[PDB]
Amino acid sequence: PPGGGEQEPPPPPAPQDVEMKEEAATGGGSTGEADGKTAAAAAEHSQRELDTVTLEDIKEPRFVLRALRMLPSTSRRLNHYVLYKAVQGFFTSNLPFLEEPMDTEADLQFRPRTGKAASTPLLPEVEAYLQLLVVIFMMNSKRYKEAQKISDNRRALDLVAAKCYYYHARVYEFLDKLDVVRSFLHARLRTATLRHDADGQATLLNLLLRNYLHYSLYDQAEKLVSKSVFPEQANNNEWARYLYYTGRIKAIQLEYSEARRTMTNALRKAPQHTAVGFKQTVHKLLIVVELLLGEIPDRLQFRQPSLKRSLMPYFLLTQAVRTGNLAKFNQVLDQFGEKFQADGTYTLIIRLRHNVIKTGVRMISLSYSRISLADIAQKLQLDSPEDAEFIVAKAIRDGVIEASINHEKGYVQSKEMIDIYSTREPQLAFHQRISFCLDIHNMSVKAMRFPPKSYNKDLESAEERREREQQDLEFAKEM
Amino acid sequence: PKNPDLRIAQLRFLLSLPEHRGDAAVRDELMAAVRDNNMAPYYEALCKSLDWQIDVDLLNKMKKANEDELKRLDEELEDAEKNLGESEIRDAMMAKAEYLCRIGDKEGALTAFRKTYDKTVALGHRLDIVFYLLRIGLFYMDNDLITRNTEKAKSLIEEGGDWDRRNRLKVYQGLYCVAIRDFKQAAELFLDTVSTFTSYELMDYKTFVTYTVYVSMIALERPDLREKVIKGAEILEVLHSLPAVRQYLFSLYECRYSVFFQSLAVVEQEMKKDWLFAPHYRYYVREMRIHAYSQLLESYRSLTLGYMAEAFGVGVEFIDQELSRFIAAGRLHCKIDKVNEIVETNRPDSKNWQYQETIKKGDLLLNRVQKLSRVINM
Amino acid sequence: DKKFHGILDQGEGVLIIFDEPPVDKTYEAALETIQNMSKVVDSLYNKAKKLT
């Protein structure tokens, strides 16, 4: 009894108090602001929702019996908060928290408000240990939310519901089927994108793609023809994961040129927060695909504390691939195949042999000028000299090297191509970035004039000084 | 104070990287720390070293001696308050902040120094404070400290000649520059071989000579070499007592490549275990070797590689693979043919090289400025 | 010793002598300006990112 009298009492009052201005005041201001004005995003308090989600994530009977049927009930809500606090201080409070929104005069008269209120129970119920709020009961609460979803008037409800049917997906993600979630999402997508433009063409796309790939079906038809590619309103958080998904989709189909740029943009759109969960994966792929595309080094050495422990296999891998040796590649694959399979990346790196052999032959071509093929096999350990002829021939085909070969003799001789400065390519190289440096100036200037505003102050010299000047001039002209 | 303590830091490193070296250093460092009341550098180092169970008596008596000294110092503070000159409290606290630094941690010494910097009205004592900060930063490798203190010293040194102080700053800046892999800057700032006193950071003038010749091997080419480091008798007379470095330099100058490699191996072995050269001791080596090749290939044009075996080191395949991996890197412009075992040379113009670095530095700066562009404006 | 630039042939003893254009002033100024603006951009952190 003595132990629980000094640290247990504090938990009750202080969190309630600091919540009274965190979500109670937030709800009160949103009701008269989001549902009281057309500021939308401004008075929608999506960042207040954000903060009250992130803080409560790492953080109900009183707040569920909120009443606002009449003005006295709405006024009462706030004194009833203190009344329930006093009851909690004196007495011990408590399914029976789902019928209250239909009772206790609960007439918010704003869907934007009752939605967030309902979702707030769902988030704790989702995070109620691993119980899943008695499983389907959380889903049933979200089934209630889905009934609310069909309620209507979306000058706020839309951007309120986004988060709702984003956690809704997580509910099934942690449990049972997802196929019928896909059916629902497909329907909901055209339920939107038809009410002119309403957004959600960002969140629903990511929700659909999150486990479309996880089920391991690489359908792409609708992605190339999707009209929701361009919501243009993503808060710079949705856009990153959307670009990541489309980049992996593009890269898995033997397309490397565009995936690098799009997914590098996606990675560099990532925020500054300490969490590095998805950045681990995007980095890992962003350097596998760069190894695949030609032989760009990618070895922009990463030793940051967060990423150091994870990417230890990959460092060893790049070490083998950069050199022309091939036994090292097998000695790495047979060692880390299971680890790569656990990462879902065995299929991409299993086709890396061609890149290794291209690097080796290019290095051999650049180093020597006249070498017998009776040693190329020994240096690259192909175990046979005759097929080295075919390998070199294929290399010459694609313009890898311009060396000729005397088949009757056996030695390979290479041409000499120097003085690239006179070639037209450096002009192209300069132009490609002249374009960028000209674009950035216009981009910067475009947004400079937005902050200058409220400059109504426009006065020249005076108002009544003109009469004094005229009088002085007349007096001077009189004499 | 921190005049003798530099070597202690060396020993710390000598017990970190050398695993086999764990016998004598742990003892000489130990009884160097037991005196002088050095309490700081073995809070965690005691964990790094052996358990050393028998220390609680020593720990207690040593920390109580520390407390006795500190309370004495407070006594003189209050004594100086009533009958003060230039606030002799501040004179005493400046005079004993170095004691606290010698015994305690960074926080107390740094705070005491930053507070006592305001009592001194003359430039000399300000410079002494700044030099104390440079020294502690060199101990604990605090880069921003080094940079800010160096720029403050340079902004304080133009008022008045202080050419001895200027030379001291030059030596400090050279020491910082060797730690970073900037070598040309070191060789330029290590041309103070006629103004280096028997300083407190390099016990040996001869060690200073060895460092400057080592960096001058890389930084500068043949005319300057042949003009400055071989025609300045002030270092020739010192080198007369150092046969190893003398023959090491003469081997490179006189093209006796056979004796060059043993000396190079000895030098790199010695500098592997030396401080402020280990972190990149391999890099250095991989320069000299390639440099030697560039000292021989430009005189001739069709030299056979067999000549290397009896002129540079036995082993045809070794030279073959070495030259191959050096050609692949983009340096040492030449070419080799295996069917007839011949080595040809070429003369690329000094334009293409003057182009690649331009394009790549432009790329990196453009990337950086794009990051700046998007990080601002939401 | 760079006093005389050419090339020596060991096969028969022919001293090929050639000359090269003056090393251009074109690019070292570009190089220094690039590093100078890099330093300016780096110094721009202390007033751009910290304040915003």
Binding site: I434, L438, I440, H441, S444, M448 | V369 | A30, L51
Partner: peptide
């Protein structure tokens, strides 16, 4: 190339100045 680079960085500095000259003044109206 070089000139366009310099032009861009100067315009960037100008934008930074404008924005900080706004966010530290707009708050004065409460």
């Amino acid at each position: 190339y070089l000139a366009s680079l310099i032009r861009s960085v100067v315009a960037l500095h100008n934008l930074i100045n404008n924005k900080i000259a706004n966010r530290d003044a707009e708050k004065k109206e409460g």
